[PDB]
Write a protein that binds this ligand. Structure first.
Ligand SMILES: NC(=O)c1ccc[n+]([C@@H]2O[C@H](COP(=O)([O-])OP(=O)(O)OC[C@H]3O[C@@H](n4cnc5c(N)ncnc54)[C@H](O)[C@@H]3O)[C@@H](O)[C@H]2O)c1
Ligand SMILES: NC(=O)c1ccc[n+]([C@@H]2O[C@H](COP(=O)([O-])OP(=O)(O)OC[C@H]3O[C@@H](n4cnc5c(N)ncnc54)[C@H](O)[C@@H]3O)[C@@H](O)[C@H]2O)c1
Ligand SMILES: NC(=O)c1ccc[n+]([C@@H]2O[C@H](COP(=O)([O-])OP(=O)(O)OC[C@H]3O[C@@H](n4cnc5c(N)ncnc54)[C@H](O)[C@@H]3O)[C@@H](O)[C@H]2O)c1
Ligand SMILES: NC(=O)c1ccc[n+]([C@@H]2O[C@H](COP(=O)([O-])OP(=O)(O)OC[C@H]3O[C@@H](n4cnc5c(N)ncnc54)[C@H](O)[C@@H]3O)[C@@H](O)[C@H]2O)c1
Lengths: 337, 330, 337, 330
C-alpha cells in the first residue's frame, strides 16, 4: 500500500523528481502518474519485436507503414490544434511515435493555416460584438484574424481544383483521410502535423471533415467547380482495419466527442483496446459519451476487461506536454535512425 | 429592474405559475425563463405570414427557419419522445444529430432501453451482454435485431445507387431509414413524412457505421457523400427569412448548425442547453458570445444558454413553448 | 426492469404527469425522480406515530420542539438565500416541515436584509469595475446595492448592543444558533426564514457565522462595544444531539462545503442518516468533500449502509422548487392545524 | 501581440523551458503562466525594504502580506508537503483552512494516508474500517491515535482557560496544536514556530470537532470564540502595506480571505486555483471579477484564476515562484 506524500521542495527544484511525485500526491496528480505508467507500457509494448506468428497476422493490411507490436491511436479535439498542443502533436507524428490520428475538421485546417499566419493570445471575456467589428474570431482565450481564412482560401482553392480534376479524369475516390494526406503534402512545411503524417504514412481520420472552414471552402468551391465527393464509408473500413489487424492497441484521447468515440469504436471491432489513457474535462452525469468514464467503455468491449485504463480530469493544454515529457520524449532515441 | 422572488407554495401547487417563477428565481432558473422567452419569440416569428431550386428542397419556407440539434445520448434518453413530438407536428425545420442519435431512435422501435445506474461495473455488464449509456442499459440483442432489420435495406440502397443513379448522403439515408421503420414512435419516421431533413456528417461513428461496415464485405460499394449534405444544410440557412437555433449539448451538432448560420452572417435567435464549460477552450463549452465574434449569431440577437442537463430542462422548455402553441401547428 | 420513455406531449400539457415522467427519462431526470421518492419516504416516516419505546429514547433532548419519527436536516449554501429559493426554504420552515437548518453566514444575513431591501436580477458578465463604481455588488447573476448593507447596519447595531449587555449583565453565552434565533425574532417579518425558524423552535447552525456581512458588523461594533463572544463548541453539542437522539434522520442538502459536511458529520454520530438527497453541481474528481458522491459518505458511516441515497447533479435553483412541488407541498395538510 | 506556440520537444526535455512554454500554449496553460507572473510579483513586492498593538500580533510587517488559503482535502493530499514548505520558510503570512485541513496535518504525524481509487465501494470500505477521501484512504485507527494524542492537550486547554484566563479561539488552538505535535513534517508546527496565524472559523466541522465534543462530556467547559479571530484576521489586512491572496479551492477559505481584504478596499494581487464554475451563482465558482464588484480585489489589480485541480498545478506553481527565490528567504 502506497502512502500519500508530496514532493518536498527542501530538496530544491529537481523537476524530474517533482513530476514523479505526482503519483503519490493524490486526486488528479495520482491519475497523471497512472497515465504516465500506461503510456510507458504502450511504448514498451510497441518497441517489443514482432514474433513470426504476430508479424504474419498483422501484415494483413496493405498499409505502407511498417507494423509494430502496439498500434497507438491519438485523438484530439479541434481547439487543441488552435492551442500550442499543436506543437506537441506535431513532434509525436514527426517521429513516428503514434500510428493513427483522429481529429475533427478544425483540427485539420488550423494546422495548415498556422503555416500561413499565426494564432494570438487573447482572453475568454473579450466581447464578441467588438471582436466581430474588428474582424477577429475568438477560440477560447485565443484569437484568429479573419485574414487568416482569406489566406487559407487563396492557398486551398487551386488544390480543390486539382482534386476535382483528378476525381473526374483519373478515377480518384476521395475520402477525408485521403484529402488530409494530400493537404499535408501540399503544405510542405515541417511545422505542420499533417505534413509529417503523410510523410510517415500515418492516416488521419475525420468523418465530419465538412464541419469547419475547410467545409466553407469546399462549399463555395462547389458553385464554380461542382461535384467533389468525400466518401466516409471507405474511411470507416480503413480506420477499423487498423484496429482489427493490430497485435496490441493503445488509445491516447485528448477531449471528447467524435474523436473519442471513433477511436473507441474502431477498437471495439477487435473486442477492445489493451491500453487507454483519456485526458478530458467532461463529466459523466449528463449521460454523454464525452464524459463517460473508461469503465463505461469496458461494458461495450471498447476497452478490454483486463486493461487498466486511466482518465485524467484536466485541461490537456496543461497535462499533455507533461505526459509527453515523462513518456515518448524519454524514449526518443528508440524512434529514430 | 426586476426583484428576485421565488414561487410561494402558500399558493398551493400551480405548476404553470411555478415554472413562470423560475424567471425571477436567479442563476440558471433565470436563464430558463429567458430561454422560454427566446423560443417563444422564434415561434411567434415562424407564425408570421409570408427557392426550392436554390435549396433543392421540397419544404416550404416559413418566416423563421428553426434548426434543432441534439447529441446522441439524448435519443438514448426519454428526450427522444420530446423531440419526436416536435418533429411529428412540423414545429422545427432542420435536425442535426450524431449517428447514435439516428440509430437509437430506430432501435427503440425494435426493443427498449432500460434504466440502470452510472456506477454499474463494466466487466459484469460485458459478461452479461449489456451495454451502458450513462445510467441507461442496452442489451446486445437490441443490436442483433437492428442488424436483421437493416441488412435488406442496405441491399436496396446499394442496388439503387448502382442502377438508379442515387447519390447517397447521410440526410438521404436517414430519410430512407425513417420511411422504412414505418413506426409513429420514431423521430425519423416523422421527419421524412414532414420533409424535415436530418444532417449527420459523421454518420459512420456508431452502430449504423458498424452495420454498414459489415454489410460492405457482403455487398460492396455503398458510398455516403458529405459534400452534397454540406450544400443542403448551408442553403437552408442562406435562403431563410430568419433563423433560430435550439441546441441541446455540444460537439458536431452545435458547431454544424452554427456554421450553417455563419453563412447568412448569423442566427436571429439562439437557445443552448448544455453542461459544458468554457475554460478548456472547447467549442462545446463556448459561451454564445464567442459565436457572436465569428458571426454565427447576429450582434443584435439576444442568445441564451442554460447550464443544465437537458433531460431535466428540455421537457419543461417544450411545455412552456411549442406545446402551448399547438393549435397554430395544428 | 423499467423502460426508458419520456413524457408524450401528444397527451397535452399535464404538468403532474410530465414531472412524474422524469423518473423514466434517464440521466439527471431519473435522479430527480429518485430524489422525489426518497424525500417522500422521509415524509412518510416523519408522519408515522412514535411508539412508546421510540418516544422515550427521543424525548432525551430538552428541545421544546415536539419530536417526530424522522428528524430532517435541511442544508443550503448562502447564494441560494440570495436566490428565490429563499421563498422555498421559508415555506418549509414556516410549516414545520424540516427540523434543523444548516447554512453559512450569507445564508443568514441575506434573509434578514431581504426584509429591508430587495435583491435584483442582473447578468453574470457585468464588469466588476463599473459595478463597484456604482456601488452595486454582484452575486452570480444577481445584484445587491451597497445601500442594502447600510440598512442592515442601522437595523443590526442596536441589537448587538443589547446582546453584549445581556452577555455582560444577564450571563447569556452566545453561540451562532442562539444569535440566529434572536435575529429572526427581531426581524419580526413573515417573509423571513429565520423569523419562522425561531417561531417554530427550529435551530439554525452556522459555525463560521463571522464569514460575511454579519461578521463585518460585529467587527466594527466590537471597537465601540467590545467583548461579544460567539462560542462554536456549544453549538457542536447542540447539532450533534439532534442526530444522536433521533428515531430516524433524513438529510436534504443543497450545495456543498461546510453546510454539507456539518450535517453529514452530525449524522455520523448516530452511525448514519437513514435517507439522504443531495442537489449540487460539484464533481468528485478534485477530491473535495463538496463533490464527493453519497457513496463516499457511506464509507465513513455518515449514511447508513442500507440507505438508498440520491444525488441530483444540477443547479438547485431549477430542481429544488420542482422537488418541493412533488413532495412536501402535496402533504401540506398533514403539517398544519 | 503574443503568438500561440507550444514547447518543441525536438529541443529535448528541459523542464523549466517546458513550464515556461505554458504561457504561450493557451487555455488554462496560459492562465498558469499568468499565475506564475502574479505570484512572482507578490514575492518581489514582499522583498522590498520597509502596529503590533493594533494587530495584536508579534509577526513583523513586510512590504506584502500574503494570505494562503486551501480546502481540507488538499491537506489529505500530498499538497500538504508543498504548503508545509512555504510555511517552514516563512514565505506566506496568514493561513486559512477548514477543520480537516488542520486535523489531517496533525494525524499524518501519527499515521499515513494511503492511495486508493474514487470508485471503491463504501459498504466494503466501512466493513473494513477504512474511510475514503476522493481516491485516498484513512484507516479508522488513524483517528484512534489522534484521540489518544489530543485528549491530554484538551485537558490542559480547559485548565488554562479556567485558571489562567486564556480565551481560546480557533487560531490560538491551532497554534497550540502545532506546538504540541512538535514534528517538522507538520504545517502547523512550522506556522506557530514562525508566528504565522491560522484562521479556521468552523474549526468544529471535522474530527477535531468530534474529539472536542467527546472530550466535553469528560471535562466540560472549553469555549472557542470566533469573534476575536475575526478581529485578528481583518486587522492583518487593514494594516498591510500591500496584500496578495493565493487561494486553492473555494468555500469558507476563499471568502474569509477575500472578506478580510474587503476591509482595506481590496487585495493588490490575487491568484485562484480551483475547479468550481460560476453558473450556479456560488461564491466558490465566482470569477475574480465578481470580487472586484465588492471591493475584495482592487480595480487596478490583475487577478488570475487557473481552472484546474490544485494537486496538479500547485507544485508546479511553487517550483516556478517561491522555490526559485529561496535564497531571499533564507
Ligand atoms: N477551433 C475550434 O474549436 C473549431 C474550429 C472549426 C470547427 N470546429 C468544429 O467544432 C466541432 C466540435 O469540436 P470538437 O468535437 O473537436 O470538440 P469540442 O471543442 O466541442 O470539445 C468536445 C469536448 O472535449 C473535451 N475537451 C475540449 N477541449 C479540451 C481540453 N483542452 N482539455 C481536455 N478536454 C477537452 C471537453 O469535454 C469538450 O466538451 C467539430 O466538428 C469541429 O470541426 C471547431
Ligand atoms: N452516446 C451514445 O449514445 C452514442 C451511441 C453511438 C455513437 N455515439 C457517438 O459518440 C460521438 C460523440 O457523441 P455526441 O457528439 O453526440 O455528444 P457527447 O455525448 O460526446 O456530448 C458532447 C457534449 O454535449 C453536452 N451534452 C451531452 N449530454 C448533455 C445533456 N444531457 N444535457 C446537456 N448537455 C449535454 C456535454 O457538454 C457533452 O460533453 C458521436 O459521433 C456519436 O455518434 C454515441
Ligand atoms: N451570497 C454569497 O455567496 C455570500 C455572501 C456572504 C458570505 N458568503 C460566504 O461565502 C462562504 C462560502 O459560501 P458557501 O459555503 O455557502 O458556498 P459556495 O457558494 O462557496 O458554494 C459551495 C458549493 O456548493 C455548490 N452549490 C452552490 N450553489 C449551488 C446551486 N445553486 N446549486 C447546486 N449546488 C450549488 C457548488 O458545488 C459550490 O461550489 C460562506 O462562508 C459564506 O458565508 C457568501
Ligand atoms: N474533505 C476532507 O478531507 C474533510 C475532512 C474533515 C472535514 N471536512 C469538512 O468539510 C467542509 C468542506 O470542506 P472544504 O470547505 O475544505 O472544501 P470542499 O472540499 O467542500 O471544496 C470546496 C470547493 O473547493 C474547490 N476545490 C476542492 N478541491 C480542489 C482541488 N483539488 N483543486 C482545485 N479546487 C478544489 C472545489 O470547487 C470544491 O467544490 C469543511 O468544513 C471541512 O472541515 C472535510
Amino acid at each position: 500500500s502506497t502512502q500519500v506524500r508530496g514532493y518536498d521542495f527542501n530538496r530544491g527544484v529537481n523537476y524530474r523528481a517533482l513530476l514523479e511525485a505526482f503519483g503519490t500526491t493524490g486526486f488528479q496528480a495520482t491519475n497523471f502518474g497512472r497515465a504516465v505508467q500506461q503510456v510507458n507500457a504502450m511504448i514498451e509494448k510497441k518497441l517489443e519485436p514482432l514474433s513470426q506468428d504476430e508479424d504474419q497476422h498483422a501484415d494483413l493490411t496493405q498499409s505502407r507503414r511498417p507494423l509494430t507490436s502496439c498500434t497507438i491511436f491519438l485523438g484530439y479535439t479541434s481547439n487543441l490544434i488552435s492551442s500550442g498542443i499543436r506543437e506537441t502533436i506535431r513532434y509525436l507524428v514527426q517521429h513516428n511515435m503514434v500510428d493513427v490520428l483522429v481529429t475533427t475538421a478544425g483540427g485539420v485546417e488550423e494546422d495548415l493555416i498556422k503555416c500561413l499566419a499565426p494564432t494570438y493570445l487573447g482572453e475568454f471575456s473579450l466581447r464578441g460584438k467588438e471582436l466581430r467589428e474588428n474582424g477577429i474570431n475568438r477560440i477560447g482565450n485565443l484569437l484568429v484574424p479573419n485574414e487568416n481564412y482569406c489566406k487559407f482560401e487563396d492557398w486551398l482553392m487551386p488544390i480543390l481544383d486539382q482534386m476535382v480534376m483528378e476525381q473526374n479524369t483519373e478515377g480518384v475516390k476521395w475520402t477525408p483521410s485521403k484529402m488530409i494526406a494530400r493537404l499535408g503534402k501540399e503544405i510542405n512545411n515541417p511545422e505542420s502535423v499533417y505534413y509529417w503524417a503523410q510523410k510517415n504514412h500515418i492516416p488521419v481520420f475525420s468523418p465530419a471533415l465538412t464541419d469547419g472552414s475547410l467545409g466553407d471552402m469546399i462549399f463555395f468551391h462547389s458553385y464554380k467547380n461542382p461535384g467533389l465527393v468525400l466518401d466516409i464509408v471507405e474511411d470507416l473500413r480503413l480506420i477499423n482495419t487498423q484496429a482489427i489487424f493490430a497485435k496490441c492497441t493503445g488509445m491516447i484521447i485528448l477531449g471528447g466527442g467524435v474523436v473519442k468515440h471513433h477511436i473507441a469504436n474502431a477498437n471495439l471491432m477487435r473486442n477492445g483496446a489493451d491500453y487507454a489513457v483519456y485526458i478530458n474535462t467532461a463529466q459523466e452525469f449528463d449521460g454523454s459519451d464525452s464524459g463517460a468514464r473508461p469503465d463505461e467503455a469496458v461494458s461495450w468491449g471498447k476497452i478490454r476487461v483486463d486493461a487498466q485504463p486511466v482518465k485524467v480530469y484536466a485541461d490537456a493544454s496543461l497535462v499533455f506536454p507533461l505526459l509527453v515529457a515523462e513518456t515518448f520524449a524519454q524514449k526518443m532515441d528508440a524512434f529514430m535512425h
